[PDB]
Design a protein around this ligand. Structure first.
Ligand SMILES: [Mg+2]
Ligand code: NA
Ligand code: NA
Ligand SMILES: [Zn+2]
Ligand SMILES: [Zn+2]
Lengths: 314, 314
């Protein structure tokens, strides 16, 4: 039962958290063929540490690895340290640049601890932002696509107030997001997807009865996309379209429009993809779990589910 | 097996559609005790017509009835006529005023035909609005509660642009809506409900990182409601709370926040409650079905499900 059909970069996240642990446990479960498609980015010391704990010493030899985020002192399982914050970022930075340059086709990032990163002096508002910085893009040109229960919902805005989101929406922004998410769909194994665009306002404005935004923003975006030769329905009322369940990719205007479906239908088995240039970075949708770090009791299910998704055949 | 534990007004909707039929079929299935709790509002001629068709003449004597929406000519099963549009409205107007004055505790409206009403010259944008007009209230003082798959979600705003909705939210507005919906919960048979309030902004603002609205609007509303002695969690990120599924009443700020959960999880089996000034009005959630009007193929299940909900025991 083979889940990895392409080259992937795995960055092991906070070297003090469960990242290293779950990395190894997840490579354990693969055939050797599959393991050699996964390049691991992170400090060797932490993978040593997690191996002695998990009793997986055999698997270090049979592992493709690039040193990133090296440590100047021994690993301290469970401690929040400025150093470990830097490791995380360097490791993730490394894997992204191997995707950017084409050594791999996507990145998976193991958990971070935000305190550790802040304490290192690094601005971090998530993987959308980090991914932008590293690539030299604007933060509004990288987007978040959630994937769970077969719904793929890309978000035009994310993690700002509604108002701020509203005063940023534009025909161009929607277009960029759909383009990013369609190139991503090809990676996920839906090369030619049928897209549905959510309305900004309820019922997609209902012409212009419930506001003018849709007529100014979504409708002109949809026309452009169709002309470029994409199959694209809408704008339609978010509630209505999601119920039909007849699309491969939904496009949401506001955070909640996309996050409510996903976390309702797949509250732990969802994946969060950051999409920018040709880089698709997914998180493993759990924290660094410092409380259990180094006790070898951390589950890799989420990491395997994430690999299965970005490692997909079509 | 008794589903009606209080006094209800049943308005028979379009007197040409299946309303009359399903009314009678639905009263058929009740005990006589339960039938005397249900006052029927509509033209007698149409209930006569539907009774001769269905062969239920015995049940007209055993029926509490108030003439509303009288017709000046014989009933025409299946025809869209200006007259029948007026009947619907008069009947529904009547039942609401019997709730308003306290003769009954809630109203159920059988199906309407929008064309018929428009052709009579009457503005109708739904039961929220009609209920406002009849009661002499502002349309933002009536609130919509959707009910389906166990979720009860009251909406603070509804059927206006996000922006307009945003610039109307205020501590008082939230409070009004929760009060209305908690009174309604008592009718629905959850006297002492555990409430969750959705954030305006993603993640309920995250302190004030994602905007100030929540700190100005939802937090001050929640504090007030707790002090009045209500069990009330939040504000919380809509996506997060709905996933826990640990509450009897959710409170949504924007239309979509509430309508996406419902239509996704119960695209067929759901109820829309309009709430204002002691009145709870539900529809039956199917159209008037003119093509089978008088042809005795219409089942009353949806009408009975609606009665079971508004007729619930304390
Ligand atoms: Mg708006
Ligand atoms: Na993130
Ligand atoms: Na107000
Ligand atoms: Zn989020
Ligand atoms: Zn609606």
């Amino acid at each position: 039962m083979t889940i990895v059909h392409r080259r992937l970069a795995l960055a092991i996240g906070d070297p003090h958290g469960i990242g290293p642990e779950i990395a190894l446990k997840a490579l354990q479960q693969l055939s050797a063929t599959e393991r050699s498609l996964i390049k691991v980015y992170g400090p060797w010391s932490a993978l040593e540490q997690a191996a002695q704990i998990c009793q997986m010493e055999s698997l270090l030899q049979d592992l493709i690895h690039e040193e990133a985020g090296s440590l100047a002192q021994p690993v301290q399982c469970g401690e929040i340290t400025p150093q470990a914050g830097l490791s995380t970022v360097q490791s993730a930075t490394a894997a992204i640049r191997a995707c950017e340059s084409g050594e791999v086709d996507a990145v998976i990032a193991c958990p971070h601890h935000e305190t550790a990163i802040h304490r290192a002096g690094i601005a971090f508002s998530g993987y959308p932002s980090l991914l932008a910085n590293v690539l030299g893009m604007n933060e509004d040109e990288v987007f978040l696509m959630l994937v769970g229960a077969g719904l793929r919902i890309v978000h035009v805005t994310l993690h700002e107030s509604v108002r701020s989101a509203l005063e940023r929406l534009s025909p161009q922004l929607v277009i960029n997001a759909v383009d990013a998410a369609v190139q991503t769909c090809t990676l996920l194994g839906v090369p030619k997807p049928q897209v549905a665009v959510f309305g900004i306002n309820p019922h997609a404005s209902e012409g212009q009865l419930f506001g003018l935004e849709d007529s100014q923003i979504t409708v002109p975006a949809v026309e452009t996309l169709r002309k470029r030769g994409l199959t694209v329905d809408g704008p339609m009322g978010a509630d209505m379209v999601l119920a039909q369940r007849k699309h491969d990719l939904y496009v949401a205007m506001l955070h909640d429009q996309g996050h409510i479906p996903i976390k309702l239908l797949a509250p732990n088995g969802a994946s969060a993809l950051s999409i920018g240039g040709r880089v698709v970075l997914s998180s493993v949708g759990h924290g660094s779990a410092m409380d259990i770090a180094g006790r070898g009791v951390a589950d890799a299910t989420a990491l395997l589910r994430t690999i299965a998704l970005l490692g997909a055949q079509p």
